[PDB]
Ligand binder design. Structure first.
Ligand SMILES: O=C1O[C@H](CO)[C@H](O)[C@H](O)[C@H]1O
Ligand SMILES: [Mg+2]
Ligand SMILES: [Mg+2]
Ligand code: NA
Ligand code: NA
Ligand code: NA
Ligand code: NA
Ligand code: NA
Lengths: 1015, 210
């Protein structure tokens, strides 16, 4: 029957014998346990070692497995993904389905995981009531047997499937057998851009309920105009025999204080001509001055739902955390508790580099803490309902949640092929309805989403209306079909740019500012995905935040995304390394496109995270004279855990500092008058840095946590005093092949054939391993590459434009190399042309002026052909012989920063170990640049000017040729890149050019100057 | 003190090269002990009669962004025509140059002055790579105006009819010039991207005989 009916190739069958969905249950038999959320004796975990065997197809599974353990089986941890145990390969594909597109059919070779468990059941559980099993997540479909007898079937990898085992169990030992299919008709609705895995990857549990039971409950909170009064309404449903003596009590608790209670027998109000629900009752509780829930202050109450008899005997209790909040859209604005939200959001997949798609409490907490510490207040469940614990943590720590149905059909042509087809409405409906049934009581969930990237079909319209009808308390959004369809309350585009239109046919991505005011349009706009954080990215992040702050109806967005989907593999030395698409023999695959996170898989931050934190600050600052104006962007809380530290420094040297308590009302302002600052002794630039510090620890932060900062230039005193003239004069030695300059034990050598500084000596010690030469290219970032591939060139990608123009192949031709002796210096003058196939790309004209103090002043003037693609950089590079421990600079830092991602960086004196000047992006690229640098120190060297630089043990060539960070090898000495100018990194998306015009090197003529001397 | 600032000499040296003489200068402009601008130049005069002028200017970050960064002189020559390769033919400024076209333009000198009834800076042409006037040629990438009226006279005269042609010709050649604005005329209206706020500025000119 099971193999005959092939339920996994039939979208008409999404389950067999599966129980109705409902909010989290524990069946407490003690009301105080329910109140305190203590573990329930009626809810048992089957998260232990199970038996597991892999088969290539369900037809290969022997019948004997139903009755007894396979001796070839292994003992494995559950929950798990079986790919993470090495039984078969995980597959990384983005859009293209991992199976032939032939709905509803799947491959005949369909990896089948056979799970079994021998376990004990207490006799008390079988003497009365109902024993069910709950599988929180099985990917992607499964049949269940208990003691050899078939129980049921379930689909949807991301919601719990529950089955009644009451009739199947015996006291003492029982055996479960679970046949999990990798592919099913369910796979057509699970085409998310992520690793394709399978197995029993979320909790398995047993729940005991009495025969007469709470079968469902819904909690609603409604408010008066100023939120000083609320009514809690709790609808409770029962299963079992109705009796007149049955009662429901709902009580509400604020900590240990019961603030409200109501009791009633079953029997709802009249609904229609046939009466009402005899098996339901609704309790209404009045609450005066409720403490309101928000991300800012996650005030929670406890609601306890008791099923009991009239004489006071408890049958069972259920419970939930209640957050008093109202979500509504009014006059085009998303309001929470009557105030307009600014969504500092991020998309977050459930990913662990070791455990795959199994989520654990410690990782969830780690994520939430890091999110809140970096000024996020919102999370989108891209693109499926999450592990149930996630919502509990968001309720308690305070994050706004978009809960999203497990529906993505991206690889269909056209995208809405299934979603517009009524045959697929049943399968889709369950993915929406069962999510709402599970999660509707969580205050953290503020918005429902219909799924992701499935075009716009009539099924979306049907299900949009279903949610609006069943749960008016939350807006419904959905991006498919152009982000502004009839199936969305919120304009929710993905990667729509701030100012630039992308007028794609049928589904344009308008400038977000333009989108708001299109004729007839009135809705709020919140990007479901923006600022694609793939590799060296988040260029232009500040442009979004400026627009969000200026435009009331631009209420923010969700960054794509939180964490790199890299997986751990092991090399010959047993060393773990970070792997992406194709590294498991998976083909076709989309390579590094699974790594788009603000953090690495182990939760180490990428440099981009600090840019996000800074731009998402909750305090805004202005300076006028001596006065700092602090504005609060909080809607609800006062700044009751904040002080402002200020510091004034002269080119990194502290001059004065102080602290002032912050006492700002939500949306309020505070004026802070700085004391008279003593005029600086020396020439240079005064910089003011302020930071907001939280003195006290919180649930989400340590004492001393810095939440916000800003810098301003104050007075500058330009240096007019001429340095004391040196009593030494450098000497020029002219040969046919070289111009040499000597000064004491120091020597500089200019090769007359090449026109470059080929060597420098301090004594007999060589300083260079490679000559100092111009550089106009960078090892391409993920943003420079886009979707280009050797077998499928995208001619529009920056890297392909540079390659085709010959930028990477360009050869320096010497035009001029002269030497002159001045009164106090030797002057070398050079000119080079870079050419490719008869075309002059760049001309570089330099002077080198070496004086008696041993300083070498370098002037560089570059011409760039107007018709060549704008170059990635205009700078110099060389391989230094020195390997030193520290890097010390006066400039923007301390973290990696680029021209379109430097707002977070501060100007000061920074000193880091050399290894911190390299950013270990899993896919290697140009990295570690620091901008706006006036002084750089490394070993015996000092460079002064106004430049950008990176410094590391890796050449641009190696970074360019190496596809994985673990394969990199430190080269001899230290590669230094000093740029007069560097192109933006972009990132609005990572599949098309995204570097804004103002960060492109398009000026045609460029000037910069450096001084190279001894520290 | 921008209008009051006096040039203070910091450095003036001369060097003989293989095929050239190199004059190096540095000046500071100060007002009441405050240094507003520093200008560092080299003048390279070669055997072909060309004088290459390299200018590097520092602007104190806390002084209001200056109206222009350039050079001026009063030429002895009064010539009939002005010939330039750059944006024209009409007056154009950095935030008002979209209508102008890059080409070879040739106008009478009088057309290089715009007779605004209330006199001011006027007649600039931007994006100019070559300027010709009598025996003189200037090459680079600059903005310029050229007329018989000094900036001082234009500043001091309230009506165009009271202007008098001065001896010779006043040339203003700018590496950089501030936007003119105009969103309104009663509050600052020059957009940030047209303010001279970069702190350090570089430009180069070659002066020769045509
Ligand atoms: O449009 C999208 O962009 C992302 C690219 O990394 C990712 O595929 C998301 O799941 C998808 O919604
Ligand atoms: Mg099916
Ligand atoms: Mg997709
Ligand atoms: Na806004
Ligand atoms: Na991706
Ligand atoms: Na405070
Ligand atoms: Na690479
Ligand atoms: Na005037």
């Amino acid at each position: 029957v099971v193999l005959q009916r092939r339920d996994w190739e039939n979208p008409g069958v999404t389950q067999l014998n599966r129980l109705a969905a409902h909010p989290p249950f524990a069946s407490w038999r003690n009301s105080e346990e329910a109140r305190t959320d203590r573990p329930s004796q009626q809810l048992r975990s089957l998260n232990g070692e199970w038996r597991f065997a892999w088969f290539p197809a369900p037809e290969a599974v022997p019948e004997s497995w139903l009755e007894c353990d396979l001796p070839e089986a292994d003992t494995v941890v559950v929950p798990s993904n079986w790919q993470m145990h090495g039984y078969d390969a995980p597959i990384y594909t983005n859009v293209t389905y991992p199976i032939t597109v032939n709905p509803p059919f799947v491959p005949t070779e369909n990896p089948t995981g056979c799970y079994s468990l021998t376990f004990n059941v207490d006799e008390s559980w079988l003497q009365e009531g109902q024993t069910r099993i709950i599988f929180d997540g099985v990917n992607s479909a499964f049949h269940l047997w208990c003691n050899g007898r078939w129980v049921g079937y379930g689909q949807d990898s991301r919601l719990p499937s529950e089955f009644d085992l009451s009739a199947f169990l015996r006291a003492g030992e029982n055996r479960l057998a679970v046949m999990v299919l990798r592919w099913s008709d369910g796979s057509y609705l699970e085409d998310q851009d992520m690793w394709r895995m399978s197995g029993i990857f979320r909790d398995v549990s047993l729940l005991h309920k009495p025969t007469t039971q709470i079968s469902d409950f819904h909690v609603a909170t409604r408010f008066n105009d100023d939120f000083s009064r609320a009514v809690l309404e709790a609808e409770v449903q029962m299963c079992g025999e109705l009796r007149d003596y049955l009662r429901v009590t709902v009580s509400l608790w604020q900590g240990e204080t019961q603030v409200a209670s109501g009791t009633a027998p079953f029997g709802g109000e009249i609904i229609d001509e046939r009466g009402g629900y005899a098996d339901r009752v609704t309790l209404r509780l009045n609450v005066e001055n409720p403490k309101l829930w928000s991300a800012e202050i996650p005030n929670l109450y406890r609601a306890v739902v008791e099923l009991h008899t009239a004489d006071g005997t408890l049958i069972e209790a259920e419970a939930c955390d209640v957050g008093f909040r109202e979500v509504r859209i009014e006059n085009g604005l998303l309001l929470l508790n009557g105030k307009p939200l600014l969504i500092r959001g991020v998309n977050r997949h459930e990913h662990h580099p070791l455990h795959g798609q199994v989520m654990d409490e410690q990782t969830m907490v780690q994520d939430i803490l890091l999110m809140k510490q970096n000024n996020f207040n919102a999370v989108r469940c891209s693109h499926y309902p999450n592990h149930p614990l996630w919502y509990t943590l968001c309720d308690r720590y305070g994050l706004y949640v978009v809960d999203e149905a497990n529906i993505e059909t991206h690889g269909m042509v056209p995208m809405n092929r299934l979603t517009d087809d009524p045959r697929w409405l049943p399968a889709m409906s369950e993915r929406v309805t069962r999510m709402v049934q599970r999660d509707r009581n969580h205050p953290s969930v503020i918005i429902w989403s219909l799924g992701n990237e499935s075009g716009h079909g009539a099924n979306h319209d049907a299900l949009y209306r279903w949610i609006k009808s069943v749960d008016p308390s939350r807006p419904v959004q959905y991006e498919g079909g152009g982000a502004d369809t009839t199936a969305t309350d919120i304009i929710c585009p993905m990667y729509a740019r701030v100012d630039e239109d992308q007028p794609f046919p049928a589904v344009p991505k308008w400038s977000i500012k333009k989108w708001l005011s299109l004729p007839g349009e009135t809705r709020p706009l919140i990007l479901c995905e923006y600022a694609h954080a793939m590799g060296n990215s988040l260029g232009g992040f500040a442009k979004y935040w400026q627009a969000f702050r200026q435009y009331p109806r631009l209420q923010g967005g969700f960054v794509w995304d939180w964490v790199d989907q890299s997986l751990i593999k092991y090399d010959e030395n047993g060393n773990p390394w970070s792997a992406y698409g194709g590294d498991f023999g998976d083909t076709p695959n989309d390579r590094q496109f699974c790594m788009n996170g603000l953090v690495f898989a182990d939760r180490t931050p990428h440099p981009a995270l600090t840019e996000a934190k800074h731009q998402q600050q909750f305090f805004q600052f202005r300076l006028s004279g001596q006065t700092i104006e602090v504005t609060s962007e909080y809607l609800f809380r006062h700044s009751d855990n904040e002080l402002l530290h200020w510091m004034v420094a002269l080119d990194g040297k502290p001059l004065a500092s102080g602290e002032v308590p912050l006492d700002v009302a939500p949306q309020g302002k505070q004026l802070i008058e700085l004391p008279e600052l003593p005029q600086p002794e020396s020439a240079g630039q005064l910089w003011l840095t302020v930071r907001v510090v939280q003195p006290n620890a919180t649930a989400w932060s340590e004492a001393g946590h810095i939440s916000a900062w800003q810098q301003w230039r104050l007075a500058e005193n330009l240096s007019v005093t001429l340095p004391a003239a040196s009593h030494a004069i450098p000497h020029l030695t002219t040969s046919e092949m070289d111009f040499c300059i000597e000064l004491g034990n120091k020597r500089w050598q200019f090769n007359r054939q090449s026109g470059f500084l080929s060597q420098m000596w301090i004594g007999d010690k060589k300083q260079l391993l490679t000559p100092l030469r111009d550089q106009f290219t960078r090892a391409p970032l993920d943003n420079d590459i886009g979707v280009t591939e050797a077998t499928r060139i995208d001619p529009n990608a920056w890297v392909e434009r540079w390659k085709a123009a010959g930028h990477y192949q360009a050869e320096a031709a010497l035009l001029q190399c002269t030497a002159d002796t001045l009164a106090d210096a030797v002057l070398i003058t050079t000119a080079h042309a870079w050419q490719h196939q008869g075309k002059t790309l760049f001309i570089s004209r330099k002077t080198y002026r070496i004086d008696g103090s041993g300083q070498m002043a370098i002037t560089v003037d570059v011409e760039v052909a107007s018709d060549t693609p704008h170059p990635a950089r205009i700078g110099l590079n060389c391989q230094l012989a020195q390997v030193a421990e520290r890097v010390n600079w006066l400039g923007l830092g301390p973290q990696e920063n680029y021209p379109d991602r430097l707002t977070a960086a501060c100007f000061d004196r920074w000193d880091l170990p050399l290894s911190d000047m390299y950013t270990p992006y899993v896919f290697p690229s140009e990295n570690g640049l620091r901008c706006g640098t006036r002084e750089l120190n490394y070993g015996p060297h000092q460079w002064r000017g106004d430049f950008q630089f990176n410094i590391s043990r890796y050449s641009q060539q190696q970074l360019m040729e190496t596809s994985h960070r673990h394969l990199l090898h430190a080269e001899e000495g230290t590669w230094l890149n000093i740029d007069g100018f560097h192109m933006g990194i972009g990132g609005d998306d990572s599949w098309s050019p995204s570097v804004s015009a103002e960060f492109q090197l398009s000026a045609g003529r460029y000037h910069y100057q450096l001084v190279w001397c001894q520290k």
